[PDB]
Each structure stands twice: as structure tokens, then as C-alpha cells.
Symmetry: D3
Subunit: 250 residues, 6 copies
């Protein structure tokens, strides 16, 4: 291994400069499966890496796990190995009433409710996605059919209190986040997830290209916790779109 | 008049929903003169407004003056009048050595070195431009063949200390902004200007579309204080972008 | 031209060291007319500069525009040309029920709800007026018999949300400023305006003298948008005070 | 499944109230095997959970993953299922010259260089460990004869910039963290790791007991470098401490 | 005299490395008298210093006054004189319904609602007690059979608004501290006092050992102001404990 | 006693609405003795209270102790008892080269390097002195011939790291305050002391009048620790001025 965590050498990448980066290690194989010559490279902790081939060019799929910290490790080490473009494919909860479960969201920029982004740039720096990556995701979504929404996303270091969930061990939310969901809602924010603030800030401040798309598995104006019955369908929908977007970015 | 500062009514807009917003009130006539049936509506303080027509649809050009505060007045009061799309056209000084005088900068999002943005959303909220607006500015720049950089802009409430200029009365820069140009340079920030953090934040947080394009008049890796076929180029672009957004 | 925005030279000033700084460019001519030999020097963007004479000594009257940012440009560039004393004359919205339209308010120090002041001193530094300038403004007011209040002012980068106005496009106010008017009120803050925190802070932190006076055109305990027909007898009452204070400061 | 991420029922736990929480899911089975009747319960993402038995009583072993975010999910969902004591076990790298490889660090409290802790309490709230848990860990380490340090740990949301590592892609560290390691060293901070600020804050602010213990495998200040013995040393200590807290 | 505020020389200490540091200067003689060979060393301002002997070893008792600022002076200057272990014994207000007046509260760490702690470490640093000092306090309390609680303490730069007292001249609390007692209560915070955040932060940030014990004189779940007649005996309970803990740390 | 800490009743004050508030309890008798009919009222902790008479009116002299916290207690409890005007008299280290030992400094406003002021108003609020108290202190200084400076004061919760002293047990200053003295000095700040940020902030946000004056006992461009062999010459100069200012404010 050339890096401390991922268990990868520059040779393993075979000249790849683009990585699809899902949160879930089990999703890595599914994403590689839509491409050619899918091959497992390594798996340590929450970091599972495959390589595949897209229009004859080598591409990396590598899981981040949940959160900015492990995301920050995966992105840094991939970048040491030569990755310059990063596409997160995730799952998300919508907070707007018109955004349905199954919809696909493309994040232009993120509300930074994380700590890791601050380790790369002060809060005033925008967690903004790369224009070409964002353009690639929107055009990709259009071409495969999805009902898509394009906008700002709130990116939180927690699943529970930072996304104002109250059905929890304690039933309470710290003052800073009490009433917060309603305010992001009034501000047109589309959804919550957990990694994009870190990804987007660390790439935009180090000359790396990054994009972000997620599939809606729950609407927070209905429920706190996602239903299981439609999660899998939504996941494959977003995965199809990220793979197609990668294709226009080679 | 239906608004406190601009001196305009809903009627005066004639159904306009898009406004091009330069900083200099003296630039407003020049921009409107590129469009059809240009007409001065009003000027009070730093806010000079003209109406024109672009492809037979009414369009507003209205100056913001320098800074987030006057900008925030103009955007709010235009929004009360029916404006939903704001395209800023500016001048700017680049901080990256590969960016030449002449060049055009389309801003995707801004470093919020301002105060007014915080009156709409806390610092964590991104001062991000609307995607259709940015797309339309990039495509308009490609249409007239300007060399274009797309990225992040540092938006400062001062011309001097916030942009780390030392050639001043006091000659010093407060600790917070000491070494700051260097940091933004290494983070790939393209340029300094003074209104986009306010504009983009207030619009992104209230359902209004905004975009920013500027022409480069100086590179800070040479000089501190600022071939004018370039302000011309940027005005041509913002107009062409407005056409695609109507 | 010796400076980048104002369009002025050191010679234009004729050795002036005091400038009266209104916000509105269309007020500059009016203030210069209470003085001797008023002449227009320059007019660029929102910066109209005239020069007049007071007890035989040259004096600048120069508009700042709305906001700390354009105010910071005017004060700095005037300071490069030799101005050491700055007297702001403004209009303002009072937030105390005992302060009436027509009253004159002299500002001892300002609540820093602006961005530009931070570019000169950290938040903890007091946006405090120079003691001599305040003295001269208070004594000028007393000498023309104006009903005067002396205290703290809240200085906001916005006209609308930062002064907790709700009669707006969005109808709402960000968490940080919700309930804020009532807090400032209970703390004895006299009024809202938009430039004093920047002026006073940048002056007090750089060896320059500054003072602030303003006429009350509305009272926010009954109205948001000022009445149209009390912005004439008030504007001129406050202008006379700042011209008379200028005399006592030369 | 009673909880969304971990894939566990209350019944899976069999009345367990104590969880040993390593970071690496691949270490869960090993720590479980050191006790009686080890049984796998689930595995999803980075959360691998085994149940085991310690002096006749049911005990949980569950990985958090790297970082406060995933840690906060594991802890919350385990708490819903009835866990009231969490003992963090890991390996780490010291930043003091007097701390040697093979030594054990018990953490009284952490410097909060993370984001998740703030979601449970404002920054002024101390990321302190529970006194009973900390005592059990110290007594456990003494009883097997480890060379031990008891003190403050800095808990970072990054492995790289937050621990002032410069051997990176960019090779630079953001202003805020520049000079930070030297400050923490002068302040007596023993080490860096990435989960304890979130674990200790969220537990101490919700009436749950938490402690942490770690083996030192590496030292930043030291040269030359060594090198499994230290991993199994700290694990024996956490297991013996769990024993005292049942 | 070797230090500017306390009026002491190293020689006055006679090799002492441990000080008991109460808040009130009138309490110092009381604490010294429980030990052997009690001798007054000095008294300037709020700093009264006595020396005594404990199991044959010299020991300092020195008052801090109220507040982190003067606490930081006494601790810094006693440290220059060779003190390495500080044990604060104080009075305190419980905010939990199970805690009684007369009870002994041992602080593991404090919520830093103070200013002086920041002058030694940024806010993210834990105001945590030394493990040996805390251990000695707990065991000392157990040995005399005092009813004791161990946990987190809120340490406020004020007695009134920072501890959310409304029975005051103004009768109001700044928004930052409105509803704050309730949040600390829900977070399991035992109590309020005024010096521990400063003491514990400066000591832990400089390699000095510190411990914090205090007697409860009021419960804030029922009333703001402590009663008169029962304060004298609560004092005697935590004073026995802080002296006994001192014995275990020599 | 009507108040918890100070040990005073309303009747002890005899209608007094003005208090002079030194930091040092031992200085209270000194100050009262310049006036008529001085009598000790009470002494508890660092709060020593005397009452005297100035041109026929009763006046209070009451020590604050060192620091914002105890200062906040004395001002609150005196305000409950009817005090509306507070004049602090203190000692101070000058940080400008032209300001000498023996000089008198009148503070117009303070840099808030304290914690207690935040418990009354957020940081943006200016710790500004009252205009009448300041005017009276400056004119009082003029009438007795003292060499006087009027300006901003840095008000710190510590004597040592917060005023950037390095001659200490640890020998380091925390990142936040490293180089800070040179920056306050460049910003025109005259001096360091420890109570005025709290006093002035808490009074200006509650409708109480406060003034601040101090004698310079050390110059920091030369020396960290004040030299005792020039301190009692300078203390009695400033005491004279505050008593004369109080006369003008009755
Ligand atoms: O499904 P993934 O990609 O993990 O995406 C999202 O969901 C996780 C939480 O359930 C977080 O990782 C979040 O950002
Ligand atoms: O030419 P405009 O649009 O004013 O743009 C830019 O230049 C001004 C300063 O010279 C600032 O207002 C800045 O943003
Ligand atoms: O009338 P001037 O002096 O601009 O003063 C005030 O009014 C303006 C808003 O109408 C702001 O500029 C405010 O501070
Ligand atoms: O009685 P002491 O030891 O001072 O302790 C406590 O009470 C004082 C206020 O009543 C503060 O000093 C507080 O911390
Ligand atoms: O001499 P006094 O009034 O205490 O004033 C000053 O000096 C003390 C420190 O020596 C602090 O109290 C400071 O502000
Ligand atoms: O972080 C999240 N991931 C997935 C979700 F459905 C959600 O609501 N939040
Ligand atoms: O804010 C700025 N505007 C215009 C410029 F040329 C510059 O450098 N900075
Ligand atoms: O900034 C302001 N200027 C003038 C006003 F009347 C007001 O309310 N606010
Ligand atoms: O600081 C405090 N000391 C003593 C008390 F009783 C209290 O409530 N607060
Ligand atoms: O707070 C202070 N008091 C007195 C001094 F001489 C000094 O420097 N600082
Ligand atoms: K302006
Ligand atoms: K993780
Ligand atoms: K004190």
C-alpha cells in the first residue's frame, strides 16, 4: 500500500483520475457492475475499492463510510494516487414538500454543518460543487429520465440532532439546531445528508473537481425514518445517473 | 413610489422579471443602450435604474452602488417589484497569475468576507450562484469567445484591508486578514470583488436566481491599484446571458 | 487623481483636514451652502465631493453612499489626502418610544452589526466616537436648541432584516436577527442606521477623529417605512448642528 | 430491526447495558472472542456488532467506524436498545516525547476538534469521560501492569490537516490549524485520535457513561520507528475494565 | 516580595507544593486551623494567605476572590512560588432536584462560561480536573461519609444573568443565557459556580494538578437566593473533605 | 442586609445614587477620607463599603475586587440599593511610549477581552462610558492640572497572558493573544486594565451611568511588573480626580 488506510498502490489505479465515492461499502460493487471489467482492489475498514472501465478508461469506485472524517481520508489518499475528479452518490432525506421519495437531487453547494470542512477552509469558504461535474450530473439525470431537483443541501455531522430528529434516546435537540430544519426549509434547502460539505469544500479548496447527487429515501415533512420498501429502487436509480455522469467527465 | 430607495413602481417595470445589476450608476445607461427601446426610469443616491427590452421582453438595469448594504437594498426593492433574476456585471482584480487582464470570470460561489450576507443566512450557508444563471453566463462567454475562468470569488466588505492592500494611510492590515490573499490564492480563489457574497447569499436563501460575471482590470500579483475592450466584453456577455434566461 | 475612487488630488483639498460625510450624494451641495465659497471638486459613483470654507479654513463635504463598504473607501482615500477628522451627518430610525421625529441623536458608540468594521479591528474593539467630536456635536445641538439624545446606536449592513423589518419580499428574518430590535431596545439603543460602526471603528483604530449625528425621520415603535413629509425640517436641523460642530473642531 | 443503521433488535442484546466500541469493524470479532459465548448479530456499513458474555452477563461489541458522525449513529442506536456504558478501545499515536510505544493512554477528557460534539452541546461543554469508567480503566491497566498515562486527548475530524500532517497531496494546512500541534504539546495533550470528542460529549450530555483507553503503536516526535502486542494489551485492559463496570 | 499581588516570597511557603484555594478571604483562617502550626503569611486585596502543616508537610491556604480573573492571579503567582497542586473548595448552587443543600459536589470538568480560561486555551480544550486530585476528593468524601455527587459544573463569569437569575435590578437576561439553565439541567450538569473553568483550564494547560469540590448552599430548581442560617455548616462539610484530600496528594 | 454579597441595606446608603468603585478594598478608606463624614458600612469578601458626604449629599465608596465577575456583583447589588452612577478608579499599565508613569487615563470605551460583559450584551455592543461621566472626569483632570490622555482601553480577564506578559511560570502566551499587545498599540489603545469592559458594558446596557479613570503605574514598552517605588505618588492623583468628578455629577 502507498497510503495509510485504503490499501492501494498507484499501480492498482492503472492511470485512473476519476473516482465514484458512495457512502456505503456494499454499494461499491453495484456501481462497478454497471461498468466493464469490474475488479475488487481492496477492503479495509469502511473503505472498499473496486476498479472498472468506462468507454475504455479506468475508473475507481471507493466507499467513504458515513461522515466527513472518513470521507476526508478517502479523498486525500485517492488524490495522492492520482484521482482528480470525485462524484459522490448518496442517499438523502428531502425537507421540501414537493420533493418525493425516488427523486434525484444534484447539489450545487452545501450548508456546512460539519467539522471536517473547517480543517481545509474557514466557514466563509463556499462548499461549492465543480461546474462541469454538476453539469454532468444534471445532463445525466435528464438523459435517463429521473425527476430531478437542483439546489443547496444541508450537510450534517449527525443523523439525529443535526437533522432535527426528535424520535431518539433523549427526545431533545440542542439549542443551536432547534428550529433549524424549518429555517433551511424557508431558505430553499432541498435535503439533508452527511458527507457533501466535507467533500465539496476539500476539493474546491485544493483544485480537485467534485460533484454530488443523492437519491431521496425519505421526506421529513412526512416521517423521520425511511421506509425499507422503496430504498433499493431509489439507490439503483441514482447509481445509474452517477455512472452516466462519470462518462461525460472522462 | 412603491419602494423606499429606488424611486420606482411595479408599473414602471412593465412586467420585467430580470434585472442586470452593475455597481456603477454611470454604467447603467451603457448597458441598457445595447438593448431595445432604452428608457431612464429613476436615479436616487447610488441607484440609477433604466428599462429596456431584450427579444421583446422588458428588462431592468439598476445600479447597486459599492458594497453589500446598498446591494441588499436594491435587490430587496426590485424583488418587491417582481424581479426574480439578478445578473451582476462587475469589474475585478484577479489574484491568480494565469488569469490575464482582459479575461472574464464567472463566479460559481463566493467566500463571504462581508456582513450583509449574515443578515439572510448564517455563515455556513453557501453564497452560491444559481445554476441556470451560471450556465447561461458560461455559454454566453463561449458565444463571444472570451477566455473564461469559472470558480470561486472572494467578496470583501473593504477595498483595502479585506483585499490585503498595504499601500494605505495606516499601512497595516488587521491580524484576521494578514496573509489572507496567499491563503485564498492557494485555495484556488480567482479574484476579489465586493458585492457577490451578499447578492448570491440573499438570492439563494429567498428563491431568487442570481449569477455573477466580471471583467478583469488588474492582476494583483503585479500591482495593487488598477484595453477597456474588456468591460465591453463582459457587458456583451451579461446581456447575452440575460437573453437565454428570459 | 491621487486616489482610485474619489477622483481627487491633495491640491484639490487646499490643506483641508476636516470632512463632513453625509450618505446621500444629493445632500453634499446642500451642506456646502451653509459655508463660504462652495465649489464642486468631483463626482464619481456615489462619491460627490465639494469644498467650502469655515472661519477661513478649507473643509470637505463628501458623500459615502449607503453602507460601510463604500464608507470605508471614502474615509481611507480622504485620509490619504490629509483628512484627520470625519463628521457623519445622517438620517435614522429611532427604536425608543420617547425619541420623536425631528429629534437629533448624537452617537457615543455603535453596535457593530456590519462587516467592514471587522476589517480594521476585531469585534471586541469598541466602535466609539472621538471624545472631542462628540463634545462639539452635543454642544452644537444645545446651542441651536434642538431636542437631543446621546447614546448608543445600532449600525446594520442591511436596511431590512438587520433592522428587523418584516414588510419585505420574503416576510421573514434570519434566526440571528429575530427578536433583535426588542433586545437592543431593552439595552437602551436609540436607533438604527447603516454606516457608523464602520466609520467609528476604522477611525478609532487608526488615529483619526470621528463623530456621528443624525436627524430622526421615523419611529419604529409605530412604523417601518418613514413618512414622506418630515424628511425636510429634520434633515436641515441636523445639517446645521454638524456645520456648527465642524466650526468648533477646526 | 428496531434501529435504522445497526440492524439490531432489543432482543438481540439479551439485556446488555455495556458496549465495547472499537473503530474497525474487522476487530469486533477478535475482542468478542476474548469473552464467553461470542455470537455475531449483524453487519451493515461500518457497524459490525457481536454479543458476548462476561462473568455470566451479556456484553456488546460494536464498531463505530472512523469519525464522530458514524460514532454518533452507533452510540445513539445502541442507547435506544438499552446500552448505558460505552468503553472506547483503540490504538493511537502520541505527540509527547516521554510517551513510548507499548504504553496505554486513558483519556480523562478531549479537545473538541470535531463537528459532531457540537450537535449535542455547545463548545464550552467539556468532552469529559465518566469518572467510574475512567477509574475502572486505570485500575485495569495497573492490574495487568501496563505503563500508563492519564490525560487529555485531542480529537480531530481529520487524520491529516487536523493533526497538522504536511506529508499530503496539498502539503499545506489551513490557518486555524497551523501551529496547533505545538500548542497541544505545550498544553500536555498526549495524543490525537478521531472519535472521543463526539463519544464523550454525547454521553456526558445525555446521562450515559463513557471511557476510553488506547495502545500507543506510533509516536510523531520519536525516531527511529517501531514497528499486535500493543493492540491486544489495550484490549485486555478494556475487557477487564468492563468486568468492573457490570 | 517575589510576586506582585499576593505579597509573598518563596521562603514564606517553606517548600510547600500544595495550596487549598477557597474563594472567600475570611474562610482561609478557618481552613488553616484544621491543620497544624497555622501561621498568617499575608493579606492584600482579596488574597489572604496562611501557611500550615499537614502530616508534617507545609501547606498553603490562599483565597482567590470571586471570579476567574483574580483566581488566575493567585494560581499564577503561587505557581511561580512553587505550588504544583491546587484544590479549590467553594460554595455552589445546585440545579438538579436530587441534590441537597449541605451536599458535596466534586467537579470532573466544567462548562466554560468564563473569559479567563480562554486566555490559557481555546474553548475546545476541556476544563477537566486532574484525575489524582478528583480521586482523592471522592475517597476523602467517602471516608467521612458525606453525601456526594460527582459530575460536570457550569462555571459562570457572573452570579446573576450567567446563572439565569431574574430577580435583579433589570429583571432580564441577555438572549445567549435565556433558557440556559434548562439546557444545562437536561445535560446532567450538577451546579453553578464561578471559578472552576478558569482554575481547571489554566492548570491542565500548564501541567499543574487541580481539583474542585464545593458545598451546596441553594437549590436553583426551587429558589434563586441562598438562605442565611444554614451556610455555616455546609462550609464545614466540604472543608473537612478538601483538607483530607490534601493529605492523600502530599 | 437586602443583598446577598455586599452586606448592605437601603438605609445604609441614605439616598445615595452615586458610587465610586475602586478595585482594592484597602483603597476605599483612602478615598472616603477625601470627603466629609466618612464611615465604614461593611466588609465582606473583597467588597468593602464606606459612605461619605460630598457637598451635602451622601456618596458610596465600594471595592469591586479584581475582575469583571466580582465587579458585576458589586454593581448589580449596588444598583438594587439605588446607585445609578458608577465611577471606577483603578491602576493601569500604559502600552504607548508617550504615556508615562504618573499619568491619568480616561477611558471612552474598552476592548472586551473579558467574559462578564457577554453575560449582559453580545460582543458587538460597545463597552462605552457614559458621556456625562467621561466629560466630568476629563474636566476634573483639567481643573487640577494632571497630564491626561483620553481614549480606548483594553480590558482583560487576566493580568498575565491576556496582557501578553511572558515573565511567568510557563513563559508562553496562548495563540489568540500572541502579538496582541503590539496590535492594540498600533490601533491607538492606551492601556490595559481588568474591570472596565464589564463595568461599562453592564451599565450602558441597563440605563446606569458609568465612568472610568486610572493612574498609570507601569509602562509596558519598558517593563512587565510595576515598580512599587512610584505607585503611591500616582494613586493619590487619580483618587483626587474621581472625587472631583463625582462632585460634578451629584
Ligand atoms: O447512503 P450514503 O451514501 O451513506 O448517504 C447518506 O446516508 C448516510 C446516513 O444514513 C450518510 O452517509 C448520508 O450522507
Ligand atoms: O465595477 P463594480 O460592479 O462596482 O465592481 C467592483 O469594483 C468596486 C471597487 O473598485 C467594487 O464595487 C467591486 O465589486
Ligand atoms: O441618510 P444617510 O446619511 O445615508 O443615513 C442613513 O439612511 C440610509 C438608509 O435610508 C443609510 O445610509 C442610513 O445609515
Ligand atoms: O464561596 P466561594 O468559595 O467564593 O464560591 C462561590 O460563590 C461565590 C459567589 O457567591 C463565587 O465565588 C462562587 O464560585
Ligand atoms: O488597582 P485596581 O483598581 O484594582 O485596578 C487594576 O489593577 C488590577 C491588577 O493589578 C486590576 O484590578 C486592574 O484593572
Ligand atoms: O443523512 C441522511 N441520509 C439519508 C437520509 F434518508 C436522511 O434523511 N439523512
Ligand atoms: O474589489 C475590487 N474591485 C475592482 C478591482 F480592480 C479590485 O482589485 N478589487
Ligand atoms: O438606516 C436607516 N435609515 C433611515 C431610517 F429611517 C431607518 O429606519 N434606518
Ligand atoms: O456561584 C454561585 N455560588 C453560590 C451559589 F449558591 C450559586 O448559586 N452560585
Ligand atoms: O491590569 C493591570 N493593572 C495594573 C497594571 F500596572 C497593569 O499593567 N495591568
Ligand atoms: K454604497
Ligand atoms: K465513518
Ligand atoms: K475578585
Amino acid at each position: 500500500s502507498d497510503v495509510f488506510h485504503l490499501g492501494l498502490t498507484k499501480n492498482d489505479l492503472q492511470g485512473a483520475t476519476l473516482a465514484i465515492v458512495p457512502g456505503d461499502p456494499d454499494r461499491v460493487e453495484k456501481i462497478a457492475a454497471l461498468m466493464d471489467k469490474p475488479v475488487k482492489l481492496a477492503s479495509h475498514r469502511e473503505f472498499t475499492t473496486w476498479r472498472a472501465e468506462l468507454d475504455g478508461k479506468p475508473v475507481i469506485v471507493c466507499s467513504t463510510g458515513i461522515g466527513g472524517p472518513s470521507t476526508s481520508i478517502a479523498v486525500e489518499e485517492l488524490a495522492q494516487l492520482g484521482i482528480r475528479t470525485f462524484l459522490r452518490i448518496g442517499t438523502t432525506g428531502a425537507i421540501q414538500p414537493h420533493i418525493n421519495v425516488g427523486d434525484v437531487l444534484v447539489t450545487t453547494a452545501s450548508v456546512r454543518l460539519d467539522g471536517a470542512s473547517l480543517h481545509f477552509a474557514p466557514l466563509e469558504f463556499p462548499a461549492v460543487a465543480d461546474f462541469e461535474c454538476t453539469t454532468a450530473l444534471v445532463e445525466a439525470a435528464k438523459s435517463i429520465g429521473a425527476t430531478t431537483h437542483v439546489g443547496v443541501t444541508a450537510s450534517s455531522d449527525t443523523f439525529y440532532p443535526g437533522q432535527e430528529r426528535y424520535d431518539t434516546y433523549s427526545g431533545r435537540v440542542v439549542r443551536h439546531f432547534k428550529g433549524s430544519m424549518e429555517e433551511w426549509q424557508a431558505m430553499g434547502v432541498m435535503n439533508y445528508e452527511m458527507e457533501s460539505a466535507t467533500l465539496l469544500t476539500m476539493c474546491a479548496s485544493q483544485g480537485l473537481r467534485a460533484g454530488m447527487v443523492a437519491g431521496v429515501i425519505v421526506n421529513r415533512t412526512q416521517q423521520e425514518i425511511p421506509n425499507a420498501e422503496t430504498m433499493k429502487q431509489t439507490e439503483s436509480h441514482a447509481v445509474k445517473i452517477v455512472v452516466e455522469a462519470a462518462r461525460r467527465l472522462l
